[PDB]
Specification:
Elements lengths: L14 E7 L8 H9 L34 H4 L3 H5 L3 H16 L4 H4 L4 E6 L4 H7 L9 H4 L4 H10 L5 E4 L5 H15 L4 E2 L2 E2 L6 H9 L26 E6 L8 E10 L12 H14 L7 E5 L9 H11 L8 E4 L2 H4 L6 H12 L26 E3 L10 E5 L6 E9 L14 E7 L2 H13 L4 H8 L11 E7 L6 E5 L7 E5 L17 H14 L6 H7 L2 H5 L2 H21 L5 E4 L4 H8 L4 H17 L5 E4 L5 H7 L5 E7 L2 E7 H13 L6 E2 L12 H11 L32 H9 L4 H7 L5 E5 L6 H8 L4 E4 L8 H14 L25 H5 L18
Parallel strand pairs: 2-3, 2-4, 2-5, 8-9, 8-11, 9-10, 16-17, 16-22, 22-23
Antiparallel strand pairs: 1-6, 1-7, 4-6, 7-12, 11-12, 13-14, 14-15, 18-20, 18-21, 19-20
């Protein structure tokens, strides 16, 4: 009952921005914003998305997002009634927050329960007026859908954050104020992450008229640093970012050197007048507290609203605080000239640009700068230089200002992260890319983007970090192969309920020429095979030679079959364990029980290989009179009785198929009599041996003598289902340890494969681990129709690596967690700054079939 206090201690490490996502004017994702910025494409357009271009005399041009009527409510657990009475800003912010979380290499399960704080910045509240004009019952949910305080809390509620959730309203500069609050809470030890963000949508044209009444808005776009500047144009943003401690971040766009805030105080020019002295003092304080050399700043994201009285003051402060002592012009710029003014969200816009400028290593150009402002001296003395074209920002510090109305200023400094990517052993060999999404089209787009970056392993690791989300959240599970000779792609909707995974190990007969030759490409498989070969070398067996240069004459003998099949089984088990597949159940045929023991942990590699070697030796050392085995299509009760003395029934494959084994004479005669009656007595090669019969009495004992000194008894887990000792003796001591007694019993007693398969659920995913897919038909007939059956290898296939990857992809698509990247050396985090952004894929991979209510113009009159 007592609660352990949390350790709240000051943090002296680095704070890094990991994820970024958002909706920007004429941009549905960060990628579109970057493309438009770097192509000098104006994001402010003239149309009737919100209101007619000229309604009530408002300015025609405006910055508007693509759509605000879309929301994946079912993902966030919001019923239709709640979603309808929900601000579009909040819905877009939730989607953007999830996209940013995914971008930072995190997932729903990883971010759940963490000490993360939400610092949303929102000021617009026109939705209340729209929805309350014709208020009726069922609209009470507006308390939890429209109230500003719910913008962060919802984010905290869905993601299960347990940190300070707050909504700030500081006009412009709100985003930087929230960033400062997040830094304050991070450095004091209350939280480890932050979800700093903000949004701003336009609904009320009368609000635009009100702003124009105070001369805020101009005629044309925001001509920042231009002599013709006379105002700004309103814009829309729904962006958010994720902050973390640099020692735990898996991706670091940049580092937050420090942020500070202040107020212009009292002045004789009015409350709505920028104070250059206050901004200069703020810059001096921030650059002196952190000991940052002001001459080291490479780019400066200014609050270039384009107003005549604003730009000169800001620039004066910048070249009195930053340009003092600089030996080269300081590159200044502002994103307002590109996508207009974001108002409460304006700050975030700048941050976004910074991240872009800190990710692509290029400074986006500034639009509408034709004639420098004569009132701005720095543009003629060479101290300042507006970036009118793409510039190669190599590295350093970037400073951002978000001066807002009233006088509350905010400044922040970011340091570039220089970890240029280096080649990986992978990125040239086939790889398995597994992911999940809400829609099939989104998953297909994700796979296309992954193929586009098939040569990047850091991107694959970042995608993997959030590729194990439960089906309940992301139902569409898919798998593809990058750098594949043959195209492969599987996508399927997986039910919320989780199915049971059952490893199935096949027995003899799976031998062929080239078994596992292709799989040698993988490092883990080759290492496993080499370890087995080294273990078996002291006994005069060259596993390597048999596996690679072996011929059919090799498999004609008994010893090579056993050795090779078992080695392949151990290698496949090691591969599966490395990928992180935990088998909920284990079953195996004859000679496969050793593989089940090894995979269950009751047996070791050496013990299993030596058990197999002893099994083969017990038959190639003591004389065994010739015999045969056949595949009679009799029932167990039919076959077991039909066989004469000596001939017995060995393995219960399925509901109608039974092995029969006996002496070469007894057999031939009984098989012939059978063939007379309609029965498929299809004989099988056994090197003239009859396993699991009375003949195996002498070898089994010998086997025991061989294995009594090697196999250390160990408990058998409930996962492993014995196929040699019936259920009536499972509780008996003999069925507790897989010692030499178990090996002798399974080599002697009949194999109850059908009884073991009966225990498997009706919808379990059974993976057949063996050199070839033998028991596919038997297993399929055994379990039923609702179970998934996969074979890791195919006989005489031209490329077994592709078959293995396709099998794993299908298994994942049917809802089993796995780690495809576990077959290669782990990627060192944080990833290189060259890794692409994962936010765009999730942004374009949403389920937006339904359309929700949006404020209408007519509701504001």
């Amino acid at each position: 009952p007592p609660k352990t206090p949390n350790v709240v201690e000051p943090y002296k490490g680095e704070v890094a921005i990991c994820g970024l996502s958002g909706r920007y004017p004429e941009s549905a994702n960060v990628g579109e914003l970057e493309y438009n910025l770097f192509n000098k494409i104006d994001m402010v357009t003239i149309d009737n998305r919100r209101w007619e271009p000229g309604y009530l005399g408002t300015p025609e041009r405006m910055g508007k997002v693509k759509t605000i009527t879309d929301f994946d409510a079912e993902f966030f657990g919001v019923h239709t009634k709640g979603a309808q009475t929900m601000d579009p800003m909040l819905r877009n912010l939730l989607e953007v927050v999830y996209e940013a979380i995914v971008d930072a290499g995190e997932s729903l399960e990883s971010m759940k329960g963490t000490r993360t704080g939400v610092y949303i910045g929102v000021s617009n509240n026109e939705v209340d007026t729209a929805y309350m004009k014709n208020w009726t019952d069922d609209d009470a949910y507006m308390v939890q859908g429209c109230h500003h305080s719910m913008y962060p809390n919802w984010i905290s509620f869905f993601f299960d954050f347990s940190g300070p959730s707050t909504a700030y309203n500081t006009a412009c500069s709100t985003s930087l104020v929230c960033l400062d609050a997040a830094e304050r809470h991070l450095r004091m030890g209350v939280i480890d992450n932050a979800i700093v963000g903000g949004s701003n949508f336009i609904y009320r044209p009368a609000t635009t008229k009100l702003f124009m009444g105070m001369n805020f808005l101009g005629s044309s776009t925001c001509k920042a640093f231009d002599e013709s500047g006379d105002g700004f144009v309103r814009g829309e943003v729904a962006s958010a970012i994720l902050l973390k401690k640099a020692d735990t971040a898996k991706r670091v766009y940049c580092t937050l050197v420090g942020s500070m805030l202040n107020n212009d105080g009292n002045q004789t020019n009015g409350i709505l007048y920028p104070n250059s002295e206050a901004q200069e003092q703020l810059m001096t304080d921030i650059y002196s507290t952190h000991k940052i050399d002001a001459n080291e700043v490479k780019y400066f994201e200014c609050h270039g609203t384009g107003t005549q009285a604003g730009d000169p003051n800001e620039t004066r402060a910048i070249c009195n605080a930053v340009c003092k002592g600089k030996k080269d012009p300081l590159l200044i710029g502002s994103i307002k000239s590109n996508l207009g003014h974001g108002e409460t969200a304006s700050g975030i816009n700048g941050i976004s640009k910074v991240i872009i400028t800190m990710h692509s290593r290029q400074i986006p150009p500034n639009l509408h700068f034709k004639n420098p402002n004569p009132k701005i001296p720095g543009l003629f003395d060479g101290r300042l230089k507006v970036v009118t074209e793409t510039t190669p920002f190599d590295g350093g510090l970037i400073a951002i200002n978000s001066f807002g109305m009233g006088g509350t200023n905010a400044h922040a400094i970011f340091r570039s992260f220089d970890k240029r990517a280096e080649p990986h052993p992978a990125s040239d060999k086939p790889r398995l890319f597994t992911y999940c999404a809400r829609t099939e089209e989104g998953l297909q787009k994700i796979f296309e983007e992954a193929h586009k970056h098939a040569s990047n392993v850091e991107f694959h690791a970042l995608c993997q970090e959030s590729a194990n989300t439960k089906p309940k959240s992301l139902p569409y599970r898919g798998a593809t192969i990058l750098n594949a000779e043959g195209e492969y792609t599987e996508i399927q909707k997986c039910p919320s309920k989780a199915r049971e995974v059952w490893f199935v190990y096949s027995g003899m007969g799976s031998q062929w020429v080239g078994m596992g030759r292709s799989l040698m490409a993988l490092d883990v498989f080759r290492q496993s095979i080499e370890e087995t070969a080294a273990i078996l070398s002291p006994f005069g067996v060259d596993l390597m030679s048999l596996l690679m240069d072996g011929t059919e004459d090799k498999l004609k003998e008994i010893m090579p079959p056993f050795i090779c099949i078992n080695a392949i089984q151990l290698a496949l088990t090691d591969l599966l364990n490395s990928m992180g597949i935990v088998p909920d159940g284990l079953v195996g045929h004859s000679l496969g029980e050793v593989g089940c023991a090894y995979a269950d942990g009751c047996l070791t590699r050496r013990e299993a290989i030596l058990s197999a070697f002893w099994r083969a030796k017990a038959v190639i050392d003591c004389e065994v009179k010739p015999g045969k085995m056949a595949a009679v299509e009799l029932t167990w009760e039919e076959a077991k009785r039909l066989c004469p003395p000596g001939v017995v029934a060995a393995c219960h494959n399925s509901q109608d198929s039974v092995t029969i084994s006996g002496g070469a004479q007894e057999m031939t005669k009984f098989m012939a009599e059978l063939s007379a009656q309609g029965v498929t007595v299809k004989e099988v090669n056994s090197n003239n041996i009859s396993y699991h019969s009375s003949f195996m009495t002498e070898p089994a004992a010998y086997l025991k003598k061989g294995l009594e000194k090697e196999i250390v008894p160990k408990p058998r887990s409930k996962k492993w289902i014995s196929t040699s000792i019936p259920e009536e003796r499972w509780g008996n001591p003999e069925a507790q340890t897989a010692d030499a007694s178990y090996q002798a019993n399974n080599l002697l007693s009949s194999v109850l494969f059908y009884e073991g398969l009966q225990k498997i659920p009706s919808n379990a995913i059974a993976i057949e681990i063996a050199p070839a897919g033998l028991l596919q038909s038997v297993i399929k007939k055994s379990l039923g129709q609702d179970c998934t059956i996969v074979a890791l290898q195919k006989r005489k296939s031209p490329n077994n690596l592709e078959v293995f990857f396709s099998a794993l992809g299908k298994c994942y698509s049917h809802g089993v967690p796995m780690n495809p990247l576990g077959l290669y050396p782990a990627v060192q985090f944080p990833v290189s700054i060259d890794t692409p952004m994962l936010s765009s894929m999730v942004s374009e991979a949403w389920d937006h079939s339904a359309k929700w209510r949006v404020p209408l113009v007519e509701e504001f009159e």
